[PDB]
Design a binder for this molecule. Structure first.
Ligand code: MG
Ligand code: MG
Ligand code: MG
Ligand code: MG
Ligand code: MG
Ligand code: MG
Ligand code: MG
Ligand code: MG
Ligand code: MG
Ligand code: MG
Ligand code: MG
Ligand code: MG
Ligand code: MG
Ligand code: MG
Ligand code: MG
Ligand code: MG
Ligand code: MG
Ligand code: MG
Ligand code: MG
Ligand code: MG
Ligand code: MG
Ligand code: MG
Ligand code: MG
Ligand code: MG
Ligand code: MG
Ligand code: MG
Ligand code: MG
Ligand code: MG
Ligand code: MG
Lengths: 102, 141, 68, 140, 144, 62, 72, 206, 84
RNA sequence: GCGAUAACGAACGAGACCUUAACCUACUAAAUAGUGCUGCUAGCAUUUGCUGGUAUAGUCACUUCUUAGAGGGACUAUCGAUUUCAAGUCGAUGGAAGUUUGAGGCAAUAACAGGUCUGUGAUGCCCUUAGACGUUCUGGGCCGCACGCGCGCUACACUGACGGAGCCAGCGAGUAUAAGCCUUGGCCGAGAGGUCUGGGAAAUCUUGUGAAACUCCGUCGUGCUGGGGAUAGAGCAUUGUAAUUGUUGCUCUUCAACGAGGAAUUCCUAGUAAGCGCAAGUCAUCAGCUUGCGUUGAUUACGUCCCUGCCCUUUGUACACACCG
């Protein structure tokens, strides 16, 4: 249980904080001589819901088209498990959730 | 230079492999081929009663040659077509499972295909050998 | 149609009355100049302003223009 | 390695990736010769980039394309674009540009879509009708 | 596999199961004139009787015509599947049958009173001449 | 006896629905006798259109 | 209802076919039906043999359309 | 003239095309000429094509249709009546077969006959209506060259379409009969009756 | 879980606070004109670029009515309404 | 907007703005994307070639195709015409894009007795409140059929039906001690469907959703015919506690009107219309419905106020609860 091939999966609705956390981890993985793979832009998922505008059923048939974009990024690190987890606390952000899988 | 299956038109290659497979005669034909229709979406049985099974087995062999571990469920979707729902709009419906499963099972005991790892049915060591042969006897005219 | 609006027509002619010596008859050169002269919120308005400024510059060399 | 250039042509959704290598003039569609393209009535759409310049241009190069997406017709226009763009791109990199500009002249004077991808895409559908502009029949 | 000629052998009008069949119709589709014989059923009796479908009705000889009417009246004896039959799992004797031209409307009728005798809902709507399979009637079927 | 007349000037859309155009025609031979005539289909200048009858002018249409 | 085209080929019509088809600028399924009064199916088998017998030269081959011409 | 050997073999007949571009590699544009001075600029035969299928953008601007190949404008008009809209591959088959029938008959160049049938079918004066909100007031007006050309294609394909309906004659050979008769100006053909009747009514309005 | 309560820095710029404050005044029987102008001036005093208040319903009268009270500069269309 | 100008200079709305689609061999990377090489390996002619499989250690190379973030790129650019030489408009050339680049989202000042208290544990008032108008259980009905009307789906055939064969998308969705999701692959079954395993909380698996129109080759041959498939009889499965008033699917049989539709009337200008399917919503089951998506892909204007509707100016007014005066 030392240096491992470690995956960090990043998902969020907003891209600005996602790229800051993504860039901040890459920055800390640069000055620390840790070989890295990423970030990998997964195809963004558009969660679309199309309802009727009318609470009743009167009027022209008009529809809303709501959206919820989900952006997912995975970054591969080659470092011991203690090092990667403390990096996560360095780059903790409310919007982006992190899951770590070996 | 050599000849492969991909170097011959598909439509007249199958007509040549079908002719060989009928004259060879070793392919086992199930007893209901004179009764059944190819798909539940079809309304009539094939018009080439004596030869339709051979040509379909020839089509199945060529289609498997070009791909990797195709299952029998995928074969039903491929040969299925638009059903003639009376007043409702048309829809795609898969072909009959037994006809395709019997062909690949029949083709498995004639030596052309075999069950591939991780599902599907690969082409046999001899399956490549004998299909490429038929292609050569197709384009000499 | 391609009728420019007032937010681009009046903003472009303020530039000429203020930065005529540095302007030119080239859109590409004018486009870069207005990014350091004006604070434009959107890229599309920046090219639109410079593209009409170029038209006014091209028109000034043929005679006097109204509003400048 | 060797003198290899890789390009692509596109139609509505179809995209054909062309690899142009130095060789004896091998020209295959998904591993099959172009002389056996299924849409027979359109076989001359892919024959156009060949007979326009002359088959002598393909002696030293071999081309293998992989076309996916789109439909049957949309794929034919994607293939002919990848071939035409691939021949031009090879000359620009491994031949003098005088010859590359010569080939591009004949192609453009015959069909813009040989080199320039068509920008037309399907308009989105809007509610209140079964199509982009079409609307449900109205009654009073 | 080529054009052939004949004289005096063609028969313009056929009579099978007390039904008149046009002799210039192809054999597979001529039998569909016989009520109770559809396209799907006619395709198989010709194939079970070794009558190639490329023949017109008048081309057939008497020997072939009798061989077909024998099969239609005894389908199960010629490896015709039970599920392929007109009247399978019969009401009274429970055996698989295929009713034909004159027998069809008689046993179709016998089913109607059998529905009406027990006074079931489906039999009643059959009596009224209305749709029995649940179809809507407020806006369709207004002809006469 | 048809006569051909090249158009030299598109005057404007006339007629009730605007489907007909006033145009100024000049004859290919004998480049004179310029006449104003009405035309049904879409017209640019320099379109070679023949006249079944030549001796008739045109004015604004209803 | 008035068509009543002949579907069985007798001997009087057979040699009339071989005596009339050569004197045609253009023969097809409809041309045979239109002028020889034979059925469409009988025309198709007639065209495929007359080509095999050399009387008729195939201009174009297609399932839905058979374009043929005289061989003389 | 040389036969060029490639690794991917090219048939002999199709190689006979580097010298000249021919319609379906069978029909030459060299010997084709519009027999009317007034429609030369609107019948486009100057740029040869192999197959009447280019998928170009001729509906963007106003007069781009005049730049489309004349055979492609014809195959566009075939695919009508709902069930045929968008079936261009079928339309190309009819045109390809129609030309061969036009070739075996009268032995002329098939696309020369097409040009002759179009110049002979377009009415030169049509009587437009100028009614002032209901009353009948017919007025005789001239016909532009563009509408003259493209109504010929509309009438030629409409006549061929109706001749093949519920008829054993195939559409390709119904088009051939319609095109051949109208090319030689015969009044038996549809779209020649219509052209004369249009020009006849215009004579009854001046 | 941990919950923290934080004071809003600029109470005048929060429409939620201004709407709840107005309700607590309207429910006290205060006149609408005095209540409406109390949020118009409180919003502007905090530094808002603009403010508009609409009150709809029934007040002693059987028929219902709505009244708008604008002030300053207001934008209506496009994305910036989602931003500012 | 130019311009005329007792106006000058402005604000909302429009436009700007935002989302999406089309370009980038110019940056940033990608074993959940792809490729060439390279290991190992198959078939065919042997010329070293052509098609493959394999490859999560070849501990390779690359980012063109794929994904998405930071940017760049179009501003009517240049040149011809017309114009008050103004705002502009029309042509070419270059361009990925020159119709606001294509499409949408948002959208002013007021207003309607427009529609919803059957969306709300949103509501004032009235009614009811224990034999309830609450709520629950059982069964039926909302489908009920002499008829009129509207949104649609199939069709009336040969530019076609079948029968084989060829065989291409995009938008999306998917579960656990449940109350059961998407389901390949194998094996049964003519089918519908059944069964055994495995994968996938997902760019990984279903899935390249091998879709349908479409194309090729055949049968049919102008015939209410092999067009069309209502209506109905008998039988086989699925879902569900429960299918009778057939949920749906499948098999055989019956095979009706309809032979292109009067007066009228709808939608539509380019990847548009029309076909053609597929996915998502409803959903135990049922999509002839909507919301989207892509395949094939046109004819004809690019004009006008003739009809119709709306806006503006002038005008009349005994209306202002505003002609429902
Ligand atoms: Mg299929
Ligand atoms: Mg199929
Ligand atoms: Mg159908
Ligand atoms: Mg149908
Ligand atoms: Mg026909
Ligand atoms: Mg604004
Ligand atoms: Mg806006
Ligand atoms: Mg504003
Ligand atoms: Mg790997
Ligand atoms: Mg390898
Ligand atoms: Mg827009
Ligand atoms: Mg109301
Ligand atoms: Mg009301
Ligand atoms: Mg309530
Ligand atoms: Mg309530
Ligand atoms: Mg609700
Ligand atoms: Mg109670
Ligand atoms: Mg209801
Ligand atoms: Mg009921
Ligand atoms: Mg509706
Ligand atoms: Mg078919
Ligand atoms: Mg997938
Ligand atoms: Mg039925
Ligand atoms: Mg019938
Ligand atoms: Mg209307
Ligand atoms: Mg239900
Ligand atoms: Mg659904
Ligand atoms: Mg609904
Ligand atoms: Mg007044």
């Amino acid at each position: 249980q030392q240096i491992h091939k470690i995956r960090i999966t990043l998902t969020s609705t907003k891209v600005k904080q996602l790229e800051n956390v993504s860039a901040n981890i890459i920055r800390n993985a640069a000055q620390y001589n840790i070989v890295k793979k990423g970030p990998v832009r997964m195809p963004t998922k558009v969660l679309k819901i199309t309802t009727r505008k009318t609470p009743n059923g009167e009027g022209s048939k008009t529809w809303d088209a709501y959206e919820m974009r989900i952006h997912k990024r995975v970054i591969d690190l080659q470092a011991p498990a203690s090092t990667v987890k403390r990096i996560t606390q360095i780059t903790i952000e409310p919007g982006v959730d992190v899951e770590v899988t070996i | 230079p050599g000849v492969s299956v991909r170097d011959v038109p598909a439509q007249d290659f199958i007509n040549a492999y079908a002719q060989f497979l009928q004259r060879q005669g070793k392919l086992e034909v199930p007893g209901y081929v004179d009764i059944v229709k190819t798909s539940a979406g079809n309304d009539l049985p094939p018009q080439e009663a004596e030869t339709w099974f051979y040509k379909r087995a020839a089509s199945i062999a060529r289609h498997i040659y070009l791909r990797k571990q195709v299952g029998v469920g995928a074969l039903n979707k491929l040969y299925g077509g638009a059903k003639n729902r009376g007043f409702r709009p048309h829809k795609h419906v898969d072909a009959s499972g037994s006809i395709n499963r019997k062909c690949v099972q029949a083709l498995q005991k004639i030596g052309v295909l075999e069950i591939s790892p991780k599902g599907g049915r690969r082409i046999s060591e001899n399956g490549q050998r004998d299909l490429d042969r038929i292609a050569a006897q197709t384009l000499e005219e | 149609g391609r009728v420019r609006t007032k937010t681009v027509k009046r903003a472009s002619k303020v530039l000429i009355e203020r930065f005529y010596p540095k302007l030119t008859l080239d859109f590409e050169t004018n486009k870069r100049l207005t990014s350091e002269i004006a604070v434009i919120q959107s890229k599309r308005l920046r090219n639109k302003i410079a593209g009409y400024t170029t038209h006014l510059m091209k028109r000034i060399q043929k005679g006097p223009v109204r509003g400048i | 390695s060797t003198q290899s250039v890789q390009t692509f042509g596109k139609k509505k959704t179809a995209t054909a990736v062309a690899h142009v290598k130095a060789g004896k003039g091998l020209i295959k569609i998904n591993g099959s010769p172009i002389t056996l393209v299924q849409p027979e009535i359109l076989r001359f759409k892919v024959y156009e980039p060949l007979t326009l310049v002359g088959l002598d241009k393909f002696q030293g190069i071999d081309i293998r394309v992989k076309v996916t997406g789109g439909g049957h017709v949309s794929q034919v226009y994607a293939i002919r674009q990848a071939i035409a763009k691939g021949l031009v791109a090879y000359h620009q990199k491994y031949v003098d540009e005088a010859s590359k500009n010569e080939l591009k002249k004949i192609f453009a004077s015959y069909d813009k879509t040989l080199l320039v991808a068509d920008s037309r895409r399907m308009e989105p559908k809007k509610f209140g009708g079964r199509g982009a502009r079409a609307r449900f029949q109205k009654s009073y | 596999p080529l054009v052939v000629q004949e004289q005096g052998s063609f028969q313009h009008i056929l009579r099978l199961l007390n039904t008149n069949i046009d002799g210039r119709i192809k054999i597979m589709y001529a039998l569909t004139k016989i009520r109770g014989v559809g396209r799907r059923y006619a395709n198989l009796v010709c194939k079970k009787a070794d009558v190639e479908l490329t023949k017109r009705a008048g081309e057939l000889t008497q020997e072939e015509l009798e061989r077909i009417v024998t099969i239609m009246q005894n389908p199960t004896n010629y490896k015709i599947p039970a599920w392929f039959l007109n009247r399978q799992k019969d009401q009274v004797d429970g055996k698989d049958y295929h009713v034909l031209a004159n027998n069809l409307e008689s046993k179709l009728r016998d089913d109607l009173e059998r529905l009406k005798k027990i006074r079931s809902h489906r039999g009643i709507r059959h009596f009224w001449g209305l749709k029995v399979r649940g179809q809507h009637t407020k806006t369709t079927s207004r002809g006469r | 006896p048809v006569t051909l007349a090249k158009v030299i000037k598109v005057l404007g859309r006339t007629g009730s629905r605007g489907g007909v155009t006033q145009v100024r025609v000049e004859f290919l031979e004998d480049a004179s006798r310029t006449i104003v005539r009405n035309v049904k289909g879409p017209v640019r200048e320099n379109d070679i259109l023949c006249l079944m009858e030549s001796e008739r002018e045109a004015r604004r249409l209803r | 209802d008035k068509a009543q085209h002949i579907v069985i080929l007798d001997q009087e019509k057979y040699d009339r076919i071989l005596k009339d088809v050569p004197t045609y600028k253009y023969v097809s399924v409809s041309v045979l039906v239109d002028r020889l009064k034979i059925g469409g199916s009988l025309a198709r088998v007639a065209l495929r043999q007359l080509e095999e017998d050399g009387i008729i030269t195939p201009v174009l081959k297609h399932s839905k359309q058979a374009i043929y011409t005289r061989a003389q | 003239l040389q036969v060029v050997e490639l690794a991917t073999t090219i048939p002999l007949d199709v190689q006979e095309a580097q010298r000249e571009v021919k319609l379906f590699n069978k029909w030459s544009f060299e010997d084709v000429e519009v027999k009317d001075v007034s429609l030369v600029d609107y019948i486009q035969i100057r740029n040869p094509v192999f197959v009447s299928h280019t998928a170009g953008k001729y509906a963007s601007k106003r007069f781009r249709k005049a730049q489309c190949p004349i055979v492609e404008r014809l195959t566009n008009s075939l695919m009508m009546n709902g069930r045929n809209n968008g079936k261009k591959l079928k339309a190309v088959r009819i045109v390809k077969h129609a030309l061969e029938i036009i070739h075996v008959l009268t032995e002329q160049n098939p696309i020369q006959v097409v040009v002759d049938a179009i110049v002979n079918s377009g009415a030169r004066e049509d009587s437009t209506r100028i009614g002032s909100s209901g009353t009948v007031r017919r007025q005789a007006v001239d016909v532009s060259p563009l509408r003259r050309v493209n109504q010929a294609i509309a009438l030629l394909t409409i006549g061929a379409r109706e001749a093949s309906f519920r008829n054993i004659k195939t559409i390709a050979e119904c088009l051939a009969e319609e095109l051949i008769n109208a090319a030689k100006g015969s009044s038996t053909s549809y779209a020649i009756k219509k052209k004369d009747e249009l020009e006849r009514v215009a004579k009854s309005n001046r | 879980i941990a919950i923290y309560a934080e004071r809003v820095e600029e109470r005048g710029l929060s429409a939620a606070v201004q709407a709840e404050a107005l309700k607590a005044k309207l429910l006290s029987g205060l006149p609408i004109r005095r209540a409406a102008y109390g949020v118009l001036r409180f919003a502007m005093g905090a530094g808002a670029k603009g403010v508009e208040v609409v009150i709809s319903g029934k007040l002693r009268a059987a028929r219902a009515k709505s009244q708008k009270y604008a002030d300053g500069f207001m934008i209506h269309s496009g994305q910036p309404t989602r931003d500012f």
